[PDB]
Amino acid sequence: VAITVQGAQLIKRVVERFYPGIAFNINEGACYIYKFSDHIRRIRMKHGTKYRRQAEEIIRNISLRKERLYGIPVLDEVEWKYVFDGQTFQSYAFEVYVNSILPWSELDPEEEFLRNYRVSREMTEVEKFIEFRAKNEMQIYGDIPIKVWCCFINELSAELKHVPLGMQVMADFVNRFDSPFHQGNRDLSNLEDFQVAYTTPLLFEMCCMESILEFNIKMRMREEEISALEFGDMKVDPVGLLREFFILCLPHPKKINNVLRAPYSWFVKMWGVGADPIVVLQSTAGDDRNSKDVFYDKFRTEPNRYKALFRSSFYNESRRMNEEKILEAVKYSQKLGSHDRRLPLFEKMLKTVYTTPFYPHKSSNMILASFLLSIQTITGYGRAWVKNVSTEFDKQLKPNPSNLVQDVSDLTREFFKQAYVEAKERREEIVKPEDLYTSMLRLARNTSSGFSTEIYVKLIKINSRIKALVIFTKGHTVFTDEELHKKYNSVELYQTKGSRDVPIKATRTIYSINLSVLVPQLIVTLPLNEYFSRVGGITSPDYKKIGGKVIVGDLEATGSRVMDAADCFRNSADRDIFTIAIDYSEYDTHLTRHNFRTGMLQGIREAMAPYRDLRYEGYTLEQIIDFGYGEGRVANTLWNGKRRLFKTTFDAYIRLDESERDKGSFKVPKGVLPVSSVDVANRIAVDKGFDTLIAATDGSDLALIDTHLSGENSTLIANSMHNMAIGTLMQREVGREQPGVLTFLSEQYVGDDTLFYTKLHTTDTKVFDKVAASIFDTVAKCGHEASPSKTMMTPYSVEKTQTHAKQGCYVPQDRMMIISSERRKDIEDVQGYVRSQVQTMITKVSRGFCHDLAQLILMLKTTFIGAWKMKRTIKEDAMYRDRKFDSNDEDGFTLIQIRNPLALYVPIGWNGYGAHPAALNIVMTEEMYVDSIMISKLDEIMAPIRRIVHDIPPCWNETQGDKRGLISATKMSFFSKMARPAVQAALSDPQIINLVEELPLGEFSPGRISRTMMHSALLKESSARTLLSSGYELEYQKALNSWITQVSMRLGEESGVISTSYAKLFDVYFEGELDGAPHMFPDQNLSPQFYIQKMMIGPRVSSRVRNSYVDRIDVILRKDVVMRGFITANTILNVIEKLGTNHSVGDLVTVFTLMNIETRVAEELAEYMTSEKIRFDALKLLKKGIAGDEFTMSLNVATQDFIDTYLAYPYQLTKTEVDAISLYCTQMIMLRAALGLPKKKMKIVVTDDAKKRYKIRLQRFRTHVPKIKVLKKLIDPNRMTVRNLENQFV
C-alpha cells in the first residue's frame, strides 16, 4: 500500500516501455545505455574519412538487438507506432479533428492563431511562409519529451484501469498516420518534419493535459469517497463535462479557449449568491476592511437579506450577455467543423445560477468550483501574431462640456503634485546632480535597453543587451548634446517593439527605449517608485494620505497567497459588505493626451518649482522634463515591428516594373516576395486570386504612436494614479445623482483593476438599476469603456488579482504549467532546478491538486532530466574517459544515463533531492533521515529507499565552475565615473601604495575592480557563459571518477557555521497531553496529508520570528544602489572570515569603502558588526530551505507562540542555537502531525551522567571557536558568549 513501491513499479514499466529490453534494476541507483548517431559520421565521410560498416551498425542493432560495446548494451529508442500497443477506439473526436483540416487556399496570413492547415507532399512558396510561422508559434519547449508523457499516460491508465479520451484520440491518430514529427533530446526546440498537419503538437499537448486533468479529478474524487459531484441538489459528472468541453474546443483550440475562458469564470463567481439560506464562515479582524489579523470561529447558516434584489434588469443583462457569448461560440465551432454538438450540461446549469445554493462545507461543491476554474489549463502560453497599427487620432474623444475629460486631467495633476509632496515627506527625493553619473543603474525592473552593444572577448565579437555592459561601454555618450537633440520620427532613427508570451492570453507587446530617454525619466521618477513600495496603509475614502490606496507593490510581501489576501475572505464572510469590481476594456489604449498626458506633464512641471535653482551641466530641470518626455522622444513616435503583407497572384509580380521591385533595407519572411510601396500593393492586391504573398519594404507601414507606453519608467504609478482619479470621479457622480443610497467604505486600486467595499442602504430594484446606470453612464462619459458583462457587483463573492473568495472560504484556481514552458531553458544546475519544480508542485498541490499524482509526476521527472545531455565521454570497465581516440572507429556513439526514481527522496548533500515521502512540504535532511528510520511506524515506507542510498552519482552542475578563461578586449571606459572616490584615490599613486594594498579583499582591489566587474557582467550574459561550458565535461569526469559510495552524515559543521543537525547533540522526549480541539481554516480544498496538518495546527495568526543576523546583513546591504545587484551577505561574510572581526569601526569602514561600498553603508555596516561582535555570538544559521515553501507560510509554526506552546529547552542555549533547535522542532512536529501520531509536547533532555555532559561541553566549545583560525583572525575570547561557555553545563 506504500507509494514507494507502486511508484517504483510504475516508473520501471514506463522505462522498459520507452527503451525495450532495458536492463533497468530497482536495487541499483543508476543505469547506463549507449546510443548510436550517424549524423557526424556522414559529415566526416564527406571529408573522405574511411569507416567500417555504415548502415550495418544500424541494421545489425535495430534487428538483432544484442550487440555490446565494452560490455555495456546499446539500444534504440522505441518507435512511434507501438506507444499504445496499436489499440483503437474509433473516437468521435478524431473525425471532429480531421473534419477541421483546411487546405492552403483559405489562408488568412494576419490570423492571430493558426488554423488546422494541411501539409502537402509537394512544396509551394506559401507553404514556406506557413512553415516559418509554425516553427515559431507552435513550440512546446518544456523539459521532458512528449513521448515520455504519452508512455506515462498509457502506463498509468493501465494501472488505474481507466481510458482517457486523449489517449483514445492519440491511439486513433498513431494507428494510421505514424509519426507526427521528430524531436531531439539535447535541444527540445528542434521540432521538425511535420507529417500531417501544422497543428499536431498542440493536439498532443492538449490531449496529454486533458488526460492529466482526468486522472487528477478521478483520484481526488476517490480521496473524498464521493459518488458524484453536486450542483445544488443534483448530481453531475466531471469527466463528462471535461470531454464535452474538449470535443467542442477541438476545431480551433486557441481561439475557442480564449473566447470561452470568461463565461466559465463568471459562472463560478455568480454561483449561489441568491439562495434564501446562506452558509458562511465567521471571520473577525480590525475595523479597517484590509486588516490582515483574521481568525475563524465556525460555520453558520443565515437568512439572505438580498434575495429580493436579484430580479433586477442588470443581472438579467449580465446573464444574457453570457448566453449570447456561449451560443455564438457554439455556432462558430459547429460551422468550422462538421458537427452539431453543443454544451448541454453547462447551459442547463447556467439557467438557474442565482437560486441554486452553494455549499462550501460540502466537498462535492467545492471540488466542482475548483475544477471549473482549472479547466482552461489545456491551451498554455497562447502564442499569437500581432499587427502594427497607428494611433488613429480621429476616433479620440475631444473634450466638450458634455464630458469629464478636463476634470480627469486636473485631478490627476493634483494627485501627482500631492504624491510628490508625500514622497518628499518620507525622505525620498529626486536625484542630486552629484548623483547624476552613479544613479543611472537604478532603473525599474520593467525597463528595457534600446541599443545593444558589441564586445570583443579573448578573439570573438558578441552582442549584449543588459544595462550593465551597454552603460559600462558607452555611458558618457548618453547625456551628450548630440544625442539629446534628436527625434525618432524618420527613416534614419527609429525604435523596435518586442513581444513576450503569457500563460493563457495572447502575446503581450513591449517597447524598447533608448537610454537617453530613460535616464531623464529616472531622474524625476525614482523617489516615487521607491516610496510606493511600502505596505500597510489606510484605505478609507476620508483619509488624506493616498499612499495606502495603491495596492501596486502590496502583493506577495508576506509570501503566501492565502495569508496576504485574507481581506477577501473577511469581506465575503460579512453580510453587510457590497463589493464592486470595474473591468475596463483596452485601458492602455484610452490614455490620451487630452485626458492623461498633459496633466501629468504639468504635474511634473510645477512639481519641480522649488528645485529651480539646480543645474545639470548647463541644462535646467524643465529642460530635462522635455528631454524625458516630448515630441519625437516619447509622444508622436515611429515604431517598428512585424511586417504587413498582402495577397496577390504570381504573374502580377511579373507584369510589374523594376521601380516596384526594388528591395529595401527591411527584412521579409521566408515565403513572401518583396514589393516597393504600400500604394502599389493596394493597386495590385487581389482577394480571390490567391497565388502569392507580397510584403512592403520601403518603411511606409511603421506604427505612429502617441499613447502611453508600457516600457516607460513610471507605467504602474501612472496607471494606478489615473484609476484613482477615475474612482474619485465615479464617487463624486454617484454621490451627486443619488445621495445617501451608497456609501464607500474602502477603495482599492491596482493596475487597471479597481475594487470597492461599500454599504448599500436599499433593496428596491428601481433604485439599484438607476445607481448602476449612473455608474455606467459616468464611466462612459469619462472616455473609457466599461463592459457590463465582466463588471462585478455582488454582496457575498470577492475577487482580486486572480484570487477568488466565496462565503468566507478560499476557492483556488490552478494555472501552473507542468508540460510546456514559456521560453527555452538550459539546465545549468539540475539539483536546484528539481528543487524549483518541487517547490512549485508544493504550491500546485496546495491549490487543490492531488498529492499522489504530484508524487508520481516528480517520480517521472527525477529520472529523465539528466539523460541525453552528457557528451564526448565514454565509460569502460566502470571508468569514464574522453571520447574514444583519434582512431575514429567508434566515433558515432554516445552514453545516456538513467537515474533511480527513488533519488527523489535522498537529501541534498548526498547528491539527491530533499523531498519527503510522507508529505511534500517536509524537507529531507540527514537528521530527518535518521529520525525517520528510527520511527517504527514509517519502516514500511522507508524500506526500499534504505537500499538505494549510497548509490547516487554526482549531479550535473555547471554553476560552480568559476575560472578566468573569459578575458575581454573591450574595456570599461566609463570607470572614471563609476569608481567611488575610495576607489579613485588608490589609482593616482606611483604603485608605492599598490604594494601596501594587501588587505584580504579578493577581486575587489584597486587596479582590478574594473576588470572583475566587467567579468561578472559577462558572466551575467548567457551568450558569454556558453564559451566556458566546453571545459566542464572534463571536470564532470573528474567528479565521477573521484566518487566513492559512502554516506557521511556529518552532524557537525564548519565552526563558523551552525545548522539544524546541532539538535542531534541531545535526546528528545515526548510528554504531556495537549488539547485536541480542531481548528478552523478557510482553504477547505486540500489533500488529507495537508488537511491533517491544517487541522492539528491552526493558521498563523502573527508575524514570524524576528529576522536572522544574515537577514539584517542583507537588509543593510539593500541600501547601496550600485552594489545591491552585486553583493550578498555571503560575499560579506566570506571577506570577513579572512579579514577578522577584531577591528574598530574605522577599519571596517575603510575596508568596505575600498570594496566599492559607499561610506554611509560602510559606517552603518561597521557599527552594526562591531555591536554584534561585542554583544552576541554572531554565527550564521544555514537552513536547507526548510519552512520556506508555500504551505508552511500559512501554518502556525516558526513563531514565538509556537515555541512557547510546543517547546521546553534548557536556558543555557543562545539565540542562534535556539533558532537552530526551533526549525528542527517545527519539522519534527509537522512530521508527527502528518503521520497521525498523538499530540504531545516535546522537550530536549540532558541527563545526569557525567560522560554525555563532557562530550556536550567539548562539542559546544569546539563549535563556538574555529580552532587554529583563532590565530588567523586574532578574535578576542573576551566576547560574552564564549567567555560565558566556561561553566555552562558543569
Binding site: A985, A986, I993, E998, L999
Partner: peptide, 17 residues
C-alpha cells in the same frame, strides 16, 4: 596587521579629496 595599511590608504583618500 591592517593598522598601517588603514592609515596609508586613508591618507591616500585624504590627499585625493
Amino acid at each position: 596587521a591592517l593598522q598601517e595599511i588603514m592609515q596609508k590608504v586613508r591618507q591616500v583618500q585624504a590627499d585625493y579629496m
